[PDB]
Write a protein that binds this DNA or RNA. Sequence first.
DNA 1: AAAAA
DNA 2: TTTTTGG
DNA 3: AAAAAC
Length: 335
Amino acid sequence: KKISQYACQRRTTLNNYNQLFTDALDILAENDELRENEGSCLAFMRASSVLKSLPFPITSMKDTEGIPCLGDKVKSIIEGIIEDGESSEAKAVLNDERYKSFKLFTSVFGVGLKTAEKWFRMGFRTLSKIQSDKSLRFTQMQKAGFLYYEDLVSCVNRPEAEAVSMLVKEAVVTFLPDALVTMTGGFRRGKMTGHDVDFLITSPEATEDEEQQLLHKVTDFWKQQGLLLYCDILQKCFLILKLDHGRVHGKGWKAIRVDLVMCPYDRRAFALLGWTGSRQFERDLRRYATHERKMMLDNHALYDRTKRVFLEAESEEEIFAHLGLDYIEPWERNA
DNA sequence: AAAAA
DNA sequence: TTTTTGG
DNA sequence: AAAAAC
Ligand SMILES: Nc1ccn([C@H]2CC[C@@H](COP(=O)(O)OP(=O)(O)OP(=O)(O)O)O2)c(=O)n1
Ligand SMILES: [Mg+2]
Ligand SMILES: [Mg+2]
Ligand code: NA
């Protein structure tokens, strides 16, 4: 059957047969992100995504026939990798000073594209020179990013994610005993590692005020136990939690990035779908809804622009059915 | 950079 | 060709 | 007042 250009019409499991090609495409996309070339960035991310869905490895140029998101530029990169097992284009990016600095600087929690570009133009090349500088002033987010750097750069494994789930559930049921807590993000998609642990929290009987106060109550509780290392509440919150080694089957603990999302009970299917990801799967779900169905999808609702009506859903399956899409399992959304 | 309009 | 590319 | 966080 014909491979769709949309990640939401493809099954993408964690068995990637084309990592030689996708690692190169991911590097080229990242360089275009840094150079603020959004269009070229997105084209390399889509090409990498479609190759991740293939049930076989590309071994010749003939194998690329009929695969969407592979134009002339991308096919030239694939040809070069088939030639000698390496990408000369990705090798040039890996040796570029601007690219090396951007990767290193943005690896700090609280440092994005703008601050990384600023530090590079100031002549900084190492994290040690940035941290020891007497004129630089750091945001509260960056201070936490540097303080817990080694823990946050080492990423989270499944026993750690599960130990965090227990902490989240224990804290949440203390204030809302009927609340449903679901682990979302990469770990829901079957990943054995991740940069953080994400959760969706919802309650069938909580009031508008109870729903608003839960994240404040849960973070104050952790602050009292000395487990809240960083907190930013937007409803959602970006946290750094202290995970004691005794809770997971040196200092005796590990800093873990945790994100919590609280949503009204009736919108829980839209929120679950939006927070499960992957990022490419989400973008293509919304792109497909707009361009193929004249619908508008977000983390709270699904709207029909022609009929001028909102479509209701109690599950992810009902959202896929409204969109006219075959149901894709969470472990098949690794686009 | 690739595909739709 | 020009426009869109998640929201 | 950008900038960072998904
Ligand atoms: N630009 C983005 C980033 C994130 N998300 C959504 C989908 C996944 C969910 C969690 O985001 P992350 O934690 O940033 O990513 P991840 O899939 O969970 O991967 P990792 O396991 O490495 O954290 O939020 C999104 O729609 N668009
Ligand atoms: Mg995540
Ligand atoms: Mg996250
Ligand atoms: Na960063």
